[model samples]
Target: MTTPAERWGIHPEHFWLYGRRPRQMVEFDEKMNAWNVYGYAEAIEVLGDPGTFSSHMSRLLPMGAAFTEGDLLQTDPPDHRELRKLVSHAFTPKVVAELEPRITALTQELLDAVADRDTFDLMTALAYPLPVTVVAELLSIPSADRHLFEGWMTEIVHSLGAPMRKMLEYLREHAAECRRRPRGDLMGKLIEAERRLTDNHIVNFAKMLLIAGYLTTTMLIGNTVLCLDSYPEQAARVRADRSLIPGLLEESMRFLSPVAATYRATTRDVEVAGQRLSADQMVMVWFGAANRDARQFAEPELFDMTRGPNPHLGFGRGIHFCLGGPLARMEGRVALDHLLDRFPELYTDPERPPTFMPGFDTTGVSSLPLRTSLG
Candidate 1:
């Protein structure tokens, strides 16, 4: 059976996704002017030590300082810790757990829209809208404005300057509105935080929150469905025991990590996986590849939910670990449960195969056309 990655031609640069191990875990890519870290242990080494492998890539990259400011993923300690502390309270476990009912309602609402159809694009019908709507609502933005966000996010991923500036402008204006009259939403809370935050800070953080909040969760739901469809036996197991859904999601994350690679700039000279690296060098850590490392996982190529101790870096590890992880996992769980409950039989549409997101930086289906049947 051709795996979904092979059939969909997803992230060809990530050969590990196709069951091929890299020649060397750590290799330098002269063309990209970066070192690629592919081994699980190597990835752990890099991610665990933020002091050496700094998340502040804008310092080395050509991005403007304005774009990097207040971005939680791009800031190092003290600043990152401070910013994270300010935002973490809003996503505490109790807070995320409380959103479950709303998440379920949104999922049901989204799935209901596609009820009459046997074949539909899951990405459009459910995956994309659900998390975006949830996050938008949390931020006090009109969920109906997701269409605007979708377009802006697509453009932003392509590194289009205008779209990002437009998003920032929108958020900046929204921040100003919140400043004028504070509300209880996350944005309003940020404005009223003990530490005074500038519009730049609020706008940049909101932009990151909006994009990070939805994009990965969107991919997570879509990718989990794709993985299940590819492995019918495993899908059957999951269907029989709904308790396996969380494990199924975890295995899917390990199998096809949505956030394929994240970049870091070396702060000082260091050696990782026996490979020498200089200070200020660009390092691309491949979470997708690391998740597939045979050294860490037995038969890593197989999508086996029974595999225990699944510590995947799908949400990443260490200080820069995804802040919205709890929310994303909740969204994925709710969305998947709803999908399973609604459809007796759901699988990929053979004729209209899913199309993966472009670029190796991220791994996920941009369009997942699936056929479903209600028995």
Candidate 2:
């Protein structure tokens, strides 16, 4: 078959995306880099082929190396196995689960601050700040320093702003402070395991948190709100019955699959969906498209609050399943629960459709102005 760039009206860059006409195969692009466009679960065949496809994705993104190489997302097997165990030692599920109350309180606090305002961007006011604060709290980072650190964290990606050396400097200093305490937060726990870890690795972990914590979480929350805004019935369903919020959140994640697709390099050759993918070529795992793949979900386009055994890949599959996945869910549940409960009349401002993040498949709005009656 002709490559996406060569045949059909599709372009090299078009194959990577969250919505609207994305491909569903391992196809080659004009850059000679092979692309992956498959349902989330099935793409695992290519993603799991460790020997052939490497998970060293940061190498592809603008500033990937800072967190990609040492972070769990990129590492494989022996190295990742031990580190994952060590990380788990400190980042236990229970410990993460404990953050729920604090997260909820924080959510309420945000609402309290802006409750009087007729309209406020949910993203900046809630989505962005919540995860940043949670991640900062997890590291025991002094509240004073987080502002500067957050500014840098938000900028590492080219879109919001360009990467600056300031973020690196702040991370180093933060790591040093954590070393002294070696007690609170996940970083402190991980620091206590330093004999088995390296300084750069620890810093890389923080960097990943700085990026993933803020960027990914912000997108998830923003996208969820956007989905509800577009489908008021979906919002009302959750409103009339609060127990459905979590399920609704999950389905919203699948329906939007924020963060779109991420790239991985192959260590060797592999065949997927009857196509050959050569080593070192760019492989785009279309997570967003995968969530909507007809092969997986019957009415893939429709949002089903009851999509249980849903098995969608919003957290991603394989060894890289997000560690903070539970915490994120907890925060989202509280955020949505309260959002629908408190602001029963939530609606999007017709003037703005919510600002969205750019690129091939990244899903999120940079700005989302939601309106509710002040009285």
Candidate 3:
């Protein structure tokens, strides 16, 4: 049987996705000039010890200080702690939980738009816009200007650096405005906070929030739907017991992780997975592969919602664990529930097969065309 991943040609480099493990847990890729960590334990080891495997990878990459400064993901210890603390003050669990009703209403509105159509592009109809709008609202940016963000995000995905600079410029200006005349939004709260963050810091932070805030969640929602579609029995189980939606999402995340890889630079000479890695070498932690490690997850390839204690590193692990995880989960749960409620049956269109997002670092469908039945 041709799996959905094989049919769609999603991340051919990700061998684990096809029931094939890497030759070694940790291997040096000369072509990419990086060490690839493929085992669950190795990945956890690297992500857990930030002092050994530093997040300050911008130093190794060709990115400028503007792109690295105040980047929560790129910062180490002391600075990272303060930055994360400030942002956490504003982006709290209560703030995210409070948006549930808003998220529910937005999902309904988006699905209603495609109510008449039996076949539609799920990415365009719902996946992309829903989280973007939510993030925009959270940042106090006009939701009406989401098309601008969509374009910028698309450009960023294509490795076009111009759009990123443009986004930073926009964020810089927005941060300046917030400093002068603050509002009650997340961005405003960050500006009004006692920490007194610089414009550069605020701009980079906002940029991170804007990109991470929506993109990962967008992929999560789309990937979960595709996973469910691939396993009809599991989908049927989820439909029968809607309460299993959270577990279903977790399984989907582990099975087809959205953010497939993250980068960390070696701070000092270290031995990872019995392989000696020198200082300053770039390390690519494969979340997608780790999630499928047989030693960690039994029958790793199978999508089983009943799988308990699924400590999958989909949102990653350790101190740098994804801050927007709760928001993303809530969005996925709400979106999936509404999708099931609105359509009696939803499956991929054979004629218009789903097109996956490019790049091995991320795993998701860029466009997922689906046929549905309202009956």
Q: Between which residue pairs do clashes occur in model 3?
A: none
Candidate 2, residues 164-202, lDDT tens digits: the string is 677666777777766775765567667766445556777
Q: Which ranges in model 1 have alpha carbons more than 4 Å from their true place?
A: 62-67, 155-162, 373-375
Which ten-residue region of model 1 has the weakest summed lDDT?
A: 61-70
Q: Candidate 2: worst 10 consecutive residues by lDDT?
A: 1-10
Candidate 3: segments with Cα more than 4 A from true spot: 61-67, 158-162, 183-185, 193-195, 373-375
The top-ranked prediction according to lDDT is 3
Candidate 3, 1-375: lDDT as tens digits: 456677677877788989998989999999999999999999999999999999987667564443577789989997888778766755567977788898999899999999778799999888988887667767777666677887788778878318888887877787787777787666776786675778987877778788787778888889988888888888898998999999988988898888999999998899987899998899999999999999999988777888999999999999899888888888999999999999888988777888877776888878889888633
Off by over 4 Å in 2: 1-24, 57-69, 89-91, 158-163, 194-196, 373-375
User: What is the number of residue pairs that collide in model 1?
Assistant: 0
TM-score of each: 0.93, 0.86, 0.94
Candidate 3 Cα lDDT to native: 0.85
Each prediction's total of clashing residue pairs, residues at least 3 apart in sequence or on different chains, is 0, 5, 0
* Candidate ordering by TM-score (highest first): 3, 1, 2
In angstroms, how far off is 285's CA in candidate 1?
0.7
Against the reference, the lDDT scores of all candidates come to 0.84, 0.69, 0.85
- Screening candidate 1 with a backbone cut-off below 3 angstroms (N, C-alpha, C), the clashing residue pairs are none
